Structures are given as C-alpha cells and as structure tokens.
Design a protein around this ligand. Structure first.
Ligand SMILES: CC(=O)c1ccc(C)cc1N[C@H](C(N)=O)c1c(Cl)cccc1Cl
Lengths: 410, 526
C-alpha cells in the first residue's frame, strides 16, 4: 500500500505493558464484533505470544446512536512516543478560538485508517480483548494503520489534512479550525443558524476528499470564572463572623490586601456562638474593602506552556461541584461550577464534569489537564466508561478532599 | 506437527549462552547418547558443527519403573538471555463461573512440546555437548528443533499453537467445551455417554493428525477432579476437604496455617470465624511458641469444626438467570455475603473485613464491600449482581449527600435481616441556641465561665487536639457547641465514624451518641 513515515519511541524507552481492567460481558461482545470487522478490512492483525506489550481497550457508547465505539487508552504509549514536531507548521494554538461565539466539534478519527503505520512500530499497539473468568489469555491484536487516540496519529496525517482543508480555509477564512487528537474544532461568530450550515458544508466537503465525519456545539464567549463569594447577612452572629474570618484568612493567601483586624476585634472573648454582633464602623469598612478585592481574579497569573495544567474538583452536594485549573497552587487560571437538583448519580456527574473541563482546557490552551479526582479508584475504574463519550483520556489521580478547602469555594 | 513456528529473539544487548558442560561419568555419558541418538532420529534435535560458540549444560537422572535415565538441560542461562512473552495464561478461573456439563473427560497431552517446532533461526542458541569418554574422541554437538523443556518460551508457544489446532474442531463442534491447562485438557459436554465418548475419540484423532498423544478410556481420569485447591464434579464443585486436627499444644506456626485454611474454606462455607484464632497471634516471640487456647478461641475453633462437618458444595452458573448478592453484618467490621441465583443455592460465599482507613462507619464500609463484590462479579461472571442490603435507602442517601467523596452503588433492595446498618449520630448543621460553647486548646473555657486544664506528656500533637474535645464532651450537657482550631479533629468527627482503632476516638464516639445536639466548629489558630 502507500508509504509509511518511520516512527520511533523516545531513545531508551520500551513499549507499554499495561493491564486491562476487567470488562463486563456486553462490553467484550461489542468489541468482538467491532474488531472482527476491523480485522477483515485489515486495520488490525492477530498476534502471537511473542509480543509482550499491552494497552487497555474500552467500549463506550454514542449520543443519539445505537453504535458502540472502541476506545483505546494510549496514555502510556503517548508518553513514550518520540516528541512530535511537524516540518510544516508545528500546529500552534489559535488564541482566538476562545473568543468565538460558537465552536463545533467534529470527530475525524476515521481519517486515520487510510494511512499505514511504520512496520516496526505496530508491535507497540498490541491490545487484548479479555475473556471472562480468565478462560483464555484473551484475543490479541495490533494495528496496521494509524490508531485513533495515539499522538503520532494526527502528526503523521498532518499533511493530508491541510490538503483536504484548503478549499475551505480560503473559501471562507472567517472560520477558525483547530485540530486536537482525533477532534476538529470549527469556530466563528456567525449567527447560530448560518453557522450550523457552514459546518454541514465542511462535513460534505470532507467526505468527497478522503474521510467521513460525525457531537458538541459550545459557545466559549459566555464562559466565565466563579470568583470567591462572601455571605451577605442581615445580622451577624459570632459563628458567622468566625466562619468569615476563617474563609477571609485563607483568601489572603491569594490577595494580600485582605485585612481581618477589625473583624477579629469584634470577636475577642468567649462569647456565645449565637450572640448577634452588631457591626462596628471600622469592621463594616474592612468588609466592604475585602469584598472589593475579591471581585476579580488576582493579578498577574500566567499560563506557561512549559508547565502542566492541573484540575481539582470538589463535591459540593445536591448535584453540584466546583473546580479550579492551575499550574501553581493559588495561581488559578480558571475556576468554575458544575450542576446537573441532585439525582442521576455521583460518578455520572463527575464524568460529565471531567469531559467538560477537558474540552475547555483544549479550546483555551490546546492541552488536556491532569485531574485530581475525589473518588476511590475501584469505583471510578468500574463506572467511568458507562458514561464516557469523548475520544481522548486525560490523566487522573485519586485524592481526599479536605472539608475546609471544600467549603472555601462555596 | 506440521505447524507454523513462532519467531523468537534474545533480549537486546546480549549474546547466547557459552556455558561449560560438567564432566560426565562415562555411564551417564552412555545414557545421554541413547537418548540423543533416538532423538536425532525423531528430528527433535540435530548434530551441528564447531565454532558455533553456544552451549548449555546437560546431565542425567532416572525415577520410576526403569533402568534408563531422564535427560535434563539447564536453561536458566538461555532463559536469562531470552525475550519475554505474553503471560502464559494469567488469571485462574473460579469454579463458580462454569456452567454444568453432563459428561467430562480430561485428556493428558504428552511430550507435546516435542511435537511443536522451534523457530529455525533460534535453535542455534539451544546447542549443547555430549562428551564421549575416550581421550582424543568426539564430544558430540547438538541443537534443538522442537520446543525444549524448561525453556522460557515453551509454555507459551505450545499453548498458542494448541489453541490454533483445536480451532476448526471447536468450530465444527460448538456443543463441547475444551479448557487447556498446562498439559491437561478438560473436555466436557451435555451429550449422552455413548455420544460423549465418541467425540472424545474424534478429538484424539484430530490431535494425532498433528502427532499429539493422548490416553484412551482405561487410562483416562474420571471426576471428581482436584484442581487448584478445588474439587470438581460435572454438576457441583467444592473446596478440597479441610482437616481440623485435634491437639492441645498449638504453636504460632500451627495457628497461622490454620487461619490460612479457614480463610480458604470461607469461599463456600458460610459462617467461618477466625477473629479469636487471630488474636492468639498478638505479641508472639517465635514460630515454635505454643499458645494456650483462650476460652473464646476454643468456642470458635469448635463451631468451626461443626460447620466443616457438614459438606457443602457450590452449584455452577446458569447464564439464563439473575445473580443475587446478599450481605450481613457478622460482628464489628465483619461482613459476610453469599452469591446465588436460586434462593439458598450458592455459587459462592465470602467475608469482608477491610479496614480502609483508621476510622469508618458501617455505611462507608458496606459501600466498600459492595465494590469488592462487584469487581469480583464482573471477573467471574461478566456481570454485576443485584444486591440485597440491610440498610434503608434513606440512611444510605442521607450519608452520601453529606460525604465529600463521590460514590455510587448498583441496584439494591432493602433486606430486613438485622442487625440493620444505621447512623448512630448526626452533628448539627447550625449552632445551638443556648447550649454552652466550649473553646478548646489540653484545656478549655466556656462562655459560662467554666474552665479546665490538663497536662499529658505521653502524647502526639494530634492526640491532644482530640483529648481536649473529649473533655469538652465529657463535661457538657446534652446539647453542646464546640469550637476548635484543629483541622485534624474536625476531619475525623466530621466524617462521623462509629468505630476506630483509636481508644480516644471510641470514647468520643460514645459521648457523641449520648448527646442530644452537638455542633462542632473550627477557627484559625493564633
Ligand atoms: C474455564 C473452564 O471451563 C475450566 C477450568 C478449569 C477446569 C479444571 C475445568 C474447566 N472446564 C471443564 C470442561 N472443559 O468441561 C468443566 C466444566 Cl466447563 C464444567 C464443570 C466441570 C469441569 Cl471440569
């Protein structure tokens, strides 16, 4: 077939050998029908016991679709694949995309199967359909074409893409199209009705060039930060003011101009928690000043492409959550809130929150963040695929949320 | 066999073995030659030539019913140099996951490794020398051509090759179930005897079509099969019988092995207990130290002997049925569960006592228990069980609302089998009007003038933060307002434990349950 661009692992590194987390029967079935079809077209090939590598695989469902989708967790392989610089553009980031009234996201993962994979590389793509109760050691395959979800993928298809995206890029240069992994982001400010059709075009304009394309329809322009909040009471008690002094002194870690001296003086003495303190003139003013400082994100905090994007989520209750994206502790680039009344279930709301914060980190910085999840691994590992719809998998860690750090956000 | 070879390579960055053969007694040398000649004559091995610098040492030793020796080859060195392979079957099937058969046979696959071809470009490293005893005489050089015993890749190439051979037969015969485990072959079906025995001989044919040897009827083994600590019948399974000896003197070692067996037995024996037997282990100075059976260790040991008297077995899986899982509280921090599809017809049983964390409550613990079982269900049956829990929806809901961690548990129905899990106490959401306010630091002072100080040196900084709270709890009335600066204490009480491995904590929890209303608040330190 056509000619392969030679791929290599960072010098010194070996292929990934990751364990497949157990899958339910319905899931292995889905994957078995999918892989047989791919096997017949020649995209994947059965392998022997002499390949010791493994990447985990999952079957995730679609929105308004009865179709399953195979999902490969290439995270370990992607960290071990040669650094990718493309001798064409280096595919930078459209700082402008974020300012767009509308952004549509297209899956172009399929473009990838029309291109062969360096032969010596194939072995590293080894994956396993596990068998129930360990009856067998599983059905082993490797890829012959560009796998969806690998980093070298869009790198290698990088040229045929611009070639397909030429009539369009100039037949209407008011459109910003960014490509991240297997996704395509089309942005503009057109009126919602005309935008929706200019996408229909692109779709059609693509099939006829060497690919097919099927999700989200976001609006970055009305996305905002949730600043720190101060309660506004009719009458204050000792408890109220103690909570206030506590929140306030955590906050002064970020905004140093925060004073609590007067507040603190209204609170010296073993007074009863429910004693109502009528406010002093100086304390009223010190509060007024503090609110003012908290009205905007702290000054001079900057996105450094050299550092990792970290995302922390907190369970607020009643189907509510709060998150913060930062690179340095306190130095927050963004903060936000997520709600779905409380009902569906924790794991679902959390998975949906993760997909949304990732989409936004991409649209804004063109990078996915590393999450700190408030859940036990075994529960997450068991259910996340039940709700996942994205085609990438960000990295995550599992943590313990402090009760204070939690309420200091709402 | 006329099968395709699997390509093998040595670990990168190294060469093959170049090991010195050990001087061989002329007699054991004579034997190596009778073994090796018959083999070159079977094409298993073949004579090579000089400056093929590769060499692995051999020798001989015999066993049962013969005056002929067994050849051994020391591959530890080639093994070191050889690449790794995909985990020769990693996982072990749990009996409870099988569907019942009507007839089952186990074919023994002999010298099969010798029936599979070794990659041609690797036989070169499997060279070894057979020394002839005369002075300036031979010293015959050989290399392997089939799969050598005890070589790193043999277990995996064979299995793979076998899987390939058995394929058309499985396609042609979808009724029959074949499970490959090392050298053995369990072949079972739902055919009537005569029919079943015929297929077996059809199979033995197919395997001979590629040179494989198996034993016919009289030399075959019959159920039960004792496999991996289990006992397997066509229609039921069980754990290999457990022996509970009678003795007066029990060493530490004795008790460990006995706790060992009791745990293994609990996968089908509902009710096994080892809490008392385990306590015997406390502070032991030697494996040979004998420990006196506490009066409670005796009872436990005795009740255990009872359960094991009666022999239970597990039923197999019926895919056409739902999986029900049931959990009960068997003591503090002890849970038991049974997995069945038909009331009282257990596929599997188990205990859970994971102390995840230093402090917990029953709701968090039931939740973790439900997680384990779930993962376990998925691995054995590919699906999750529908649970029956002794906790009301409203108790469950009420706690995971106020807990900061996300969690989620599948479909469950409330089962009224006491003891029922309940929340022992609830800290207030807002301060209490007119309840005294204790300000803690070990000591305290209240808005009513009250005061107290205490001195403790045998402490940690955390323990004192908790001491003070206890004191406040101790001296207060039925409704209290407590204020602390300690982030630690708040974290602990705030999570609402009902058990801990901390004495102090268990005393506080007690105060906590007696009180009417309690509000705990935090403020920064200085
Ligand atoms: C996964 C499997 O089928 C299996 C694993 C281990 C053993 C000892 C026998 C196995 N299968 C055998 C079999 N192949 O007939 C078996 C079944 Cl299917 C049901 C009841 C008893 C027996 Cl022995």
């Amino acid at each position: 077939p056509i000619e392969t661009v030679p791929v290599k692992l960072k010098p010194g590194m070996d292929g990934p050998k990751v364990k497949q987390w157990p899958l339910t029967e319905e899931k292995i079935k889905a994957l078995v029908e999918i892989c047989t079809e791919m096997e017949k077209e020649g995209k994947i090939s059965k392998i022997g016991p002499e390949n010791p590598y493994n990447t985990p695989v999952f079957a995730i469902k679609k929105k308004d679709s009865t179709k399953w989708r195979k999902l490969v967790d290439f995270r370990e392989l992607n960290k071990r694949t040669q650094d990718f610089w493309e001798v064409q553009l280096g595919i930078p980031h459209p700082a402008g995309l974020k300012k767009k009234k509308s952004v549509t996201v297209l899956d172009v993962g399929d473009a990838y199967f029309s291109v062969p994979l360096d032969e010596d590389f194939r072995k590293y793509t080894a994956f396993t359909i596990p068998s129930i109760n360990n009856e067998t050691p599983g059905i082993r395959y490797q890829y012959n074409v560009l796998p969806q979800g690998w980093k070298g993928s869009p790198a290698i298809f990088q040229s045929s893409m611009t070639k397909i995206l030429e009539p369009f890029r100039k037949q209407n240069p008011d459109i910003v199209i960014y490509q991240y992994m297997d996704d395509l982001y089309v942005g503009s400010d057109l009126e919602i009705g005309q935008h929706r059709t200019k996408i229909e075009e692109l779709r059609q304009h693509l099939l006829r060039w060497g690919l097919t394309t099927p999700g989200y329809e976001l609006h970055p322009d009305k996305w905002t930060v949730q600043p720190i909040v101060l309660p506004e009471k009719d009458s204050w008690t000792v408890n109220d003011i103690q909570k206030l002094v506590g929140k306030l002194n955590w906050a002064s870690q970020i905004y140093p101009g925060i004073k609590v001296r007067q507040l603190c003086k209204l609170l010296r003495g073993t007074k009863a928690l429910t004693e109502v303190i009528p406010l002093t003139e100086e304390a009223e003013l010190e509060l007024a000043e503090n609110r003012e400082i908290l009205k905007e994100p702290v000054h001079g905090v900057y996105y450094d492409p050299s550092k990792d994007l970290i995302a922390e989520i907190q369970k607020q209750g009643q189907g509510q959550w709060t998150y913060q994206i930062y690179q340095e502790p306190f130095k927050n680039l963004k903060t936000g809130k997520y709600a779905r009344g409380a009902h569906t279930n924790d794991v679902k709301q959390l998975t949906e929150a993760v997909q949304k914060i990732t989409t936004e980190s991409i649209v804004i910085w063109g990078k996915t963040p590393k999450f700190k999840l408030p859940i036990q691994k075994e529960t997450w590992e068991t259910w996340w695929t039940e709700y996942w719809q994205a085609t990438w998998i960000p990295e995550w860690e599992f943590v313990n949320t402090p009760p204070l750090v939690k309420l200091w956000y709402q | 066999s006329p099968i395709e070879t699997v390509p093998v390579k040595l670990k990168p960055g190294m060469d093959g073995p170049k090991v010195k053969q050990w001087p061989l007694t002329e007699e054991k040398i004579k034997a190596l030659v009778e073994i090796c000649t018959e083999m070159e004559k079977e094409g298993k091995i073949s004579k090579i030539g000089p400056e093929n610098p590769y060499n692995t040492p051999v020798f001989a030793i015999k066993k049962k019913d013969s005056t002929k020796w067994r050849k051994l080859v020391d591959f530890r060195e080639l093994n070191k140099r050889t690449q790794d392979f995909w985990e020769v079957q990693l996982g072990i099937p749990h009996p409870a996951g099988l569907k019942k058969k009507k007839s089952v046979t186990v074919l023994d696959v002999g010298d099969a490794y010798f029936s599979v071809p070794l990659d041609e470009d690797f036989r070169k490293y499997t060279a070894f020398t057979i020394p002839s005893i005369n002075n300036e005489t031979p010293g015959i050089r050989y290399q392997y051509n089939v799969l050598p015993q005890g070589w790193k890749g043999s277990p995996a190439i064979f299995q793979s090759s076998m899987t390939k051979i058995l394929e058309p037969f499985r396609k042609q015969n979808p009724d029959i179930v074949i499970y490959q485990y090392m050298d053995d072959l369990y072949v079972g079906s739902d055919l009537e005897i005569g029919q079943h025995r015929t297929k077996i001989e059809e199979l033995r044919q197919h395997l001979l079509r590629w040179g494989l040897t198996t034993p016919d009827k009289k030399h075959q083994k019959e159920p039960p099969f004792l496999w991996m600590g289990y006992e397997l019948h066509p229609d039921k399974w069980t754990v290999q019988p457990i022996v509970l000896p009678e003795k007066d003197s029990w060493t530490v070692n004795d008790i460990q092995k006995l706790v060992g067996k009791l745990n293994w037995a609990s996968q089908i024996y509902p009710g096994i207990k080892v809490r008392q037997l385990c306590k015997l282990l406390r502070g032991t100075k030697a494996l040979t130290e004998v420990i006196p059976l506490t009066e409670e260790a005796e009872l436990e040991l005795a009740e255990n002997r009872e359960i094991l008297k009666e022999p239970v077995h597990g039923v197999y899986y019926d895919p056409s049925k739902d999986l029900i899982a049931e959990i009960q509280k068997q003591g503090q921090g002890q849970w038991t569960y049974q997995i069945y599809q038909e009331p009282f017809k257990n596929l599997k049983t188990g205990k859970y006592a994971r102390m995840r964390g230093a402090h917990t409550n029953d709701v968090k613990q039931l939740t973790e228990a439900v997680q384990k079982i779930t993962t376990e269900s998925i691995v054995i049956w590919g699906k999750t069980p529908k649970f029956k829990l002794p906790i009301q929806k409203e108790t469950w809901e009420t706690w995971w609302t106020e807990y900061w961690q996300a969690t989620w548990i599948p479909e469950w129905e409330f089962v009224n089998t006491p003891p029922l899990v309940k929340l022992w106490y609830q800290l207030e959401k807002e301060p209490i009007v007119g309840a005294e306010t204790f300000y803690v630091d070990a000591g305290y002072v209240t808005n009513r003038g009250r005061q107290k100080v205490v001195t403790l040196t045998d402490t940690t900084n955390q323990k004192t933060e908790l001491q003070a709270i206890y004191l406040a709890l101790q001296d207060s009335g039925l409704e209290v307002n407590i204020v602390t600066d300690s982030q630690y204490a708040l974290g602990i009480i705030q999570a609402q434990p009902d058990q801990s491995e901390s004495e102090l904590v268990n005393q506080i929890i007690e105060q906590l349950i007696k009180k009417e209303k309690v509000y705990l608040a935090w403020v920064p330190a200085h």
